[PDB]
Amino acid sequence: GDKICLGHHAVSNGTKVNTLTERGVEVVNATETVERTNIPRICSKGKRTVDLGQCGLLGTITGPPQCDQFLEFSADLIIERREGSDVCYPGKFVNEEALRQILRESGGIDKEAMGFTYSGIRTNGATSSCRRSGSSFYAEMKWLLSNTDNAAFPQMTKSYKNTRKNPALIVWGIHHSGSTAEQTKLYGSGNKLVTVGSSNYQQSFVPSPGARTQVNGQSGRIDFHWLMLNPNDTVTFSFNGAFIAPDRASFLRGKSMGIQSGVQVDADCEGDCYYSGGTIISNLPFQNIDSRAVGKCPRYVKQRSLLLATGMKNVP
Amino acid sequence: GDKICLGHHAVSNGTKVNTLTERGVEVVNATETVERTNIPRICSKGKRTVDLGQCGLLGTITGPPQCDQFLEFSADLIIERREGSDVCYPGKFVNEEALRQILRESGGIDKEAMGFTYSGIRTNGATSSCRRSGSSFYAEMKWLLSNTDNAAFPQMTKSYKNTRKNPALIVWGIHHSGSTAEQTKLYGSGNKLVTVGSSNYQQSFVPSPGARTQVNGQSGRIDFHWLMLNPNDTVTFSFNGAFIAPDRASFLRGKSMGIQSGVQVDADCEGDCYYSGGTIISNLPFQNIDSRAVGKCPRYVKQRSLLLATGMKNVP
Amino acid sequence: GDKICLGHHAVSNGTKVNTLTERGVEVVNATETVERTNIPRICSKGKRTVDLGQCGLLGTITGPPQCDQFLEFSADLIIERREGSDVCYPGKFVNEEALRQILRESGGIDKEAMGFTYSGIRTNGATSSCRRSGSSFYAEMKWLLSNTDNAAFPQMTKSYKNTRKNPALIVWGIHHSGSTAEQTKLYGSGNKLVTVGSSNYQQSFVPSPGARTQVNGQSGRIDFHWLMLNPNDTVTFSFNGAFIAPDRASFLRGKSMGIQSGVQVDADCEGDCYYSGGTIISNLPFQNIDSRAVGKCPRYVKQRSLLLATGMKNVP
Amino acid sequence: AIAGFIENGWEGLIDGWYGFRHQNAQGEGTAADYKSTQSAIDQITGKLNRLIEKTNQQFELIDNEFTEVEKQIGNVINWTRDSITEVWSYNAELLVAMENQHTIDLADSEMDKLYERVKRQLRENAEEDGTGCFEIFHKCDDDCMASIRNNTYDHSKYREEAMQNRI
Amino acid sequence: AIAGFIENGWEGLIDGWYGFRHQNAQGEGTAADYKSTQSAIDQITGKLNRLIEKTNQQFELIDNEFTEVEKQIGNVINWTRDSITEVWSYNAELLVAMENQHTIDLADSEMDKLYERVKRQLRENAEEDGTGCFEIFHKCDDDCMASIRNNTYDHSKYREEAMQNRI
Amino acid sequence: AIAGFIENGWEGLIDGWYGFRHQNAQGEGTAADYKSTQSAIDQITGKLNRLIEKTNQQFELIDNEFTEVEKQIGNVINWTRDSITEVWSYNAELLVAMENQHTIDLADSEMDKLYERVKRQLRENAEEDGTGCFEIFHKCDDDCMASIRNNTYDHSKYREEAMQNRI
Ligand SMILES: *[C@@H]1O[C@H](CO)[C@@H](O[C@@H]2O[C@H](CO)[C@@H](O[C@@H]3O[C@H](CO)[C@@H](O)[C@H](O)[C@@H]3O)[C@H](O)[C@H]2NC(C)=O)[C@H](O)[C@H]1NC(C)=O
Ligand SMILES: *[C@@H]1O[C@H](CO)[C@@H](O[C@@H]2O[C@H](CO)[C@@H](O[C@@H]3O[C@H](CO)[C@@H](O)[C@H](O)[C@@H]3O)[C@H](O)[C@H]2NC(C)=O)[C@H](O)[C@H]1NC(C)=O
Ligand SMILES: *[C@@H]1O[C@H](CO)[C@@H](O[C@@H]2O[C@H](CO)[C@@H](O[C@@H]3O[C@H](CO)[C@@H](O)[C@H](O)[C@@H]3O)[C@H](O)[C@H]2NC(C)=O)[C@H](O)[C@H]1NC(C)=O
Ligand SMILES: *[C@@H]1O[C@H](CO)[C@@H](O)[C@H](O)[C@H]1NC(C)=O
Ligand SMILES: *[C@@H]1O[C@H](CO)[C@@H](O)[C@H](O)[C@H]1NC(C)=O
Numbered sequence A, B, C: 001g002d003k004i005c006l007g008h009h010a011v012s013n014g015t016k017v018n019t020l021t022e023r024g025v026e027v028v029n030a031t032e033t034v035e036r037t038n039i040p041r042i043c044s045k046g047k048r049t050v051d052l053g054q055c056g057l058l059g060t061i062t063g064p065p066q067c068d069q070f071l072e073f074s075a076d077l078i079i080e081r082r083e084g085s086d087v088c089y090p091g092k093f094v095n096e097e098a099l100r101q102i103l104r105e106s107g108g109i110d111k112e113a114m115g116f117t118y119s120g121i122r123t124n125g126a127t128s129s130c131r132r133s134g135s136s137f138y139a140e141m142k143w144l145l146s147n148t149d150n151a152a153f154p155q156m157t158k159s160y161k162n163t164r165k166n167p168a169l170i171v172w173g174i175h176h177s178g179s180t181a182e183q184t185k186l187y188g189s190g191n192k193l194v195t196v197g198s199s200n201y202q203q204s205f206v207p208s209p210g211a212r213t214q215v216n217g218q219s220g221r222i223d224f225h226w227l228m229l230n231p232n233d234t235v236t237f238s239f240n241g242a243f244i245a246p247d248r249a250s251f252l253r254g255k256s257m258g259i260q261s262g263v264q265v266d267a268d269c270e271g272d273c274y275y276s277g278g279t280i281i282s283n284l285p286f287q288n289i290d291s292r293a294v295g296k297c298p299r300y301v302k303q304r305s306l307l308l309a310t311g312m313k314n315v316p
Numbered sequence D, E, F: 001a002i003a004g005f006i007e008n009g010w011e012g013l014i015d016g017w018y019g020f021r022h023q024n025a026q027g028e029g030t031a032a033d034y035k036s037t038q039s040a041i042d043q044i045t046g047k048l049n050r051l052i053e054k055t056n057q058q059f060e061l062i063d064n065e066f067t068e069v070e071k072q073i074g075n076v077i078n079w080t081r082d083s084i085t086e087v088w089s090y091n092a093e094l095l096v097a098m099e100n101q102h103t104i105d106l107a108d109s110e111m112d113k114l115y116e117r118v119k120r121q122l123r124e125n126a127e128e129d130g131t132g133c134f135e136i137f138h139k140c141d142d143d144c145m146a147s148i149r150n151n152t153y154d155h156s157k158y159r160e161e162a163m164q165n166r167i
């Protein structure tokens, strides 16, 4: 007699997937859910991009030679590199990583002079470590010496209001001379205070001179400190030596994203989730490439692969 | 012939919901899962409530004028306000936010005298910034001056055991005078140490005097420090000037919850999940009002609304 | 007539479980999902185990008497105990908990001499607090006194390269004498600096002398500081008194796990998820014993029990 | 003319979720089924008890609107919170979506369970019309209709009559 | 008299999950079905392999019982942990609840799949009694009963006989 | 000879997911069913829209490859991150597993819904062979086969003929 059968398709090569109940049940078709594929370039299309290279990010505020291009840089995507250095004369920032975190989402920096001027001291402190056309210094900073060797250093106060609408990034420095013999040659005898007060901020600094490991010919050190000066607020610097004074305040431009990387930029390909190995273009909800990846990203998971079935059971 | 049909109800206006498989499938009935509705008042029924208003929370320990009501306040729910200030004479606490976090769940504070007494110095230090009936000071604190202008300040040690069962919140201060001319007028010449040791804790303090921005007529500053003194432990204060000494130790009463807010109290309505905009009464497992909300709360989610179906498919 | 029925098993005394739709529906069989069962011993089989007992973990670096067994200990599992102390002469580490966290996963420590030698000072500083065969000191450290009472302390610099492939844990100390009378008797008059620089690191230290609470007969205190010295880097110690100098640098051996506990070791039972109450052997994905448990563990949950059904509905 | 659930629902079914529309000599009628309606309501009410829990865990401020905390820790907090916000948003969305898919299928399954119940009591005295009805192959007055609904209908009483009319 | 799964379960079914209770001239009997019982066990054993995993990730102390850490960071840690504790508690509860709902329905579905299988092999030689049994409209000795169970029953052998007895 | 879905699938069914294999006098044929195939595709495409979302939340660096942060906070960060990594790995695994179980059952349910639809239009003129086919108890030429597929088959047209051939 005549019959009609009901059926469903199938194939020879089913893809194996996992279910609540079974490991490795075959289905007709399945798609990958975990991204493994990475582009080994920073996909920068659509975005102003500053590749700091030699220049440390914190260096853009203080202005060692490496960072002269960038003293007023403007960007959407900021790329720091492993070779990048924030200094010429050995030293570090206090609270460095916070400040980095700020500058990375800052849009870039716009500089303004704080208008200090000086009587009865020298202003042209320089060193063979920060060299441009030979011995020089941090661009945005003034190395205040005493007026002549061993000479006394006039106790001074200097101030700066932030008349703008946004806060002002203020930076200054302490000089830790390689011996007491050096501390005096530069700022004279006596012990030395540097006192910084806004209204919402007070703190103090004593120079610790002494032998240290020689770094780029230098045995001395610059501690760099900072603060956010508030609209209409004033910062005041009371000091009698060992003070690396700011010339210019910095202001944040807008919004940006910073990343750390070891691959080329590419302005042709567009992207939005970056990591050190490159950029991750993908619509998959998860990725297994790098847990520290940043931007707008797939959630990082432990697993190479989680296949999601997009077809029925295979029964062949 | 006679027939019997099986059916299920339906309506004209189905509510649209999402499923694993379909966006916006209509159902008979659905309820909201994400809370958006807020009461613009602090629902305080059932709870002792202290509205600190003008008084900063850390101010209740030190006792500037704003906080006289509250030097021994007792509460279940603590409300800080934007106008609240912890000071009269300019200054801040070191580690302020930890201490705040402690006091907010403290139940309030009970004060005890530490029984210090003083020879060959003054005790009545005062300032026009902390005014009650004219020039005055922090209530729980004593501004130790030298005995007369420029005069020497006897090196002293003073101690306090915590004989109670619970730990004792101990607070003291350093005075950062607006110049060296001031530091001497008050505590005399020489450089100045303040050394604080429990057994559990050691640390030291030097006053940094110097011009600062004028805050409420004042160019000087009080650093406020603190510690938790342990049962049976002793705190000992060795100092030779620039020391703002405690009169009274503080003890935590019980348990409370602190919040930050900009709306009225209301003792009529009951509540348990608060935020700055008010209180969130709701049984819904999620809320989309405020991610920083506190108490016993619905989990904060990104989404305006997630409708949960409470009825079958609509087929009309 | 003849009939054939289709059926499924059942029982008296179904186990009650929860579903999406019903609370307490009975099923034939169900297994527990939340672990409550704990072994009240540290299951150490398969693992080198160091039970520090009396010895504080940070004490293994500095070497008070308690820790002589352990100055070069080697382990896979490290157990700290409540009675453990890092000191003999009162004092604490700065940044103590970071350093602890390091040492706990360190595999143990291998010591190397830094080769310092000394002219025109004493080296045999000792105290009745650190006693071995009567008055003694920290094993890995040298208490540098002035050459005779009140005598001057030669300003010195001393350095150590880390020639190894791995970083070197470096430790040193500052002595906070119970009075100025003591500070002088030991290192003489004048104020006192201790300045420590690698290249990677700069910082400075002033001794704060003064009365403190008497702790094991002692009114003075040792601040202990530390750093990770990098391969090929040099640390240099410039100082003029109040300096507790290192004899030996420490190096990390391999990998270990540290835990805090109050129960016996047991080398017979094997384990991998530990807590203070003992060890948690279990394959269950969740546990309700201790949220701070460590190792490879079931996820800690709020709930006593979550029964997972392993059989069909009961209908009896 | 009259149709069942395979075609569509009944905007006229007011006092129940599930029901019966009959057509006979006396006329046409609709009554609701209580036990299948209740079963579906209870099942749904069970979900609400599960999902309308209030969290017993208490959370306190870590943060500060009025006086912002140090940047670094504040950023860590802000990051930790956002990762948690991501998790709950995902969970909340999936839960509703999962539960809604199940709530639908749950209710379809309850219609299904009623219809295949009726088919079984009607035995050999009726046929499936394919719209969710049964053509009963005998005379079924308002009483006989009410005996199907309240599950008292004995099929052998009408068997010989009906059997013959299907041939 | 005897009944099937629509009424209730069989406290007497000892050596299987699913089975057959027959009634004929020789007497009354119960045997278990192996393949449908095994299928349901495997499915459940598959869940256990999934859910009885031990986490490979290792976690170290962040915290300290003996010497408490600075308040602020300790509070951040304590907060971070509690948010995570909330997440796992939610996940654990939902997983068990979801899986239990599925474990039930899975097993009902296996009973279902067996009964509708039998109905199909019995063809036109039996009728659904509505308690989960089939009234077989011919004589079925202990052998014929065993041929249904082991899926060898050929319906055309008993057809003409049975067909006639349903009329 | 010819078989349906209860036995296995059809490696030959190229232009659809679900379908019909007929056997008659003119020969043997296979056509796909569009609406049941599409319904199953749409349902699956709905999952993909849900699960192929890109997160709108942005995350910034908290950490540093080049210059490692202080140990304590770095360890807290590293711990916080790992706990979050654990959560997403769990979620991702369960989601795929849950969704896959549902994707299977969804599609089985669509085969089911088509077969029981056909059975109902074929009425009393055919019987279930148990492999997923219907033995039609009358002559069904390529036209009559096409009228079943496109749901135009009127059973009363062939009834008296077929009814008689089942007796
Ligand atoms: C098995 O399933 C996979 C995955 O679902 C199928 O490939 C996918 O097919 C869909 C259906 O059109 C593609 O949709 C695409 O949308 C994007 C919009 O962003 C657009 O760029 C494409 O042109 C298309 O419209 C989807 O991209 C594609 N996925 C992949 C990873 O290739 C596949 O067709 C199925 N296999 C068989 C043999 O049927
Ligand atoms: C559609 O579903 C909603 C939600 O399931 C239905 O409203 C709900 O009805 C139940 C049944 O009584 C309510 O329980 C009640 O709780 C309230 C408040 O605590 C109380 O006043 C009552 O005495 C009762 O115990 C439930 O709360 C209620 N939910 C809401 C948000 O109103 C609604 O009736 C359904 N729609 C239709 C058309 O039936
Ligand atoms: C009710 O369910 C529980 C849990 O599913 C049943 O106990 C379980 O039975 C299986 C049977 O093989 C056990 O497998 C075993 O694994 C262990 C542990 O690695 C191994 O030592 C055994 O030799 C075997 O491979 C499973 O572990 C076991 N679980 C427990 C907690 O006992 C139980 O049998 C069921 N009850 C009834 C009445 O059927
Ligand atoms: C800030 O602005 C107001 C008026 O616009 C002024 O009176 C106030 O004193 C200013 N702040 C300072 C420090 O001068
Ligand atoms: C604490 O007080 C007890 C008596 O309450 C006293 O004898 C003792 O000296 C104190 N503690 C210690 C460790 O000595």
Ligand SMILES: *[C@@H]1O[C@H](CO)[C@@H](O)[C@H](O)[C@H]1NC(C)=O
Pocket (backbone or CB within 6 Å): C232
């Ligand atoms: C260590 O590095 C310094 C860097 O200037 C270099 O001078 C020296 O050659 C290096 N020594 C060894 C043994 O690697």
Ligand SMILES: *[C@@H]1O[C@H](CO)[C@@H](O)[C@H](O)[C@H]1NC(C)=O
Pocket (backbone or CB within 6 Å): B291, D071, D074, D075, D078
């Ligand atoms: C943290 O988040 C809040 C809003 O949730 C924002 O207003 C605040 O300024 C953020 N702080 C930092 C340091 O990013």
Ligand SMILES: *[C@@H]1O[C@H](CO)[C@@H](O)[C@H](O)[C@H]1NC(C)=O
Pocket (backbone or CB within 6 Å): E071, E074, E075, E078
């Ligand atoms: C943190 O948690 C534990 C309980 O988990 C408690 O004993 C401890 O004191 C808490 N610490 C703080 C600072 O809240």
Ligand SMILES: *[C@@H]1O[C@H](CO)[C@@H](O)[C@H](O)[C@H]1NC(C)=O
Pocket (backbone or CB within 6 Å): F071, F074, F075, F078
């Ligand atoms: C934190 O994580 C990374 C692995 O992603 C590791 O290389 C790094 O050194 C870790 N840091 C600490 C302090 O554990």
